[PDB]
């Protein structure tokens with residue numbers, strides 16, 4: 407049963423999300439492997455390890471390689487403005 411949540415993070419006080427992403431669509435997809443204390447995601451508290459990362463700032467992370475996902479996340483985090491993550495709960 408579908409369990410989708412959208413998390414908009416104010417990145418005024420945070421310099422990184424503090425997430426590690428594992429796996430990719432072979433369909434499966436890209437998962438939150440771990441969440442690092444000190445990051446925006448940990449502070450917000452809603453996203454948990456095992457959540458599937460679907461979308462960041464209107465970019466579809468479905469059918470995206472792990473390498474590509476890391477590079478896109480880096481580009482987004484290195485630019486100003488709030489970051490909107492949409493995940494499927496485990």
Ligand SMILES: Cc1ccc(S(=O)(=O)Nc2ccc(F)cc2C(=O)O)cc1C
Pocket residue numbers: 421422423424425426427445475476477479480481483484
């Ligand atoms: C410790 C640290 C800090 C910042 C970054 S980032 O600016 O390149 N952004 C990310 C990129 C990929 C990713 F899976 C997570 C992040 C993040 O902001 O936590 C990456 C990492 C590994």
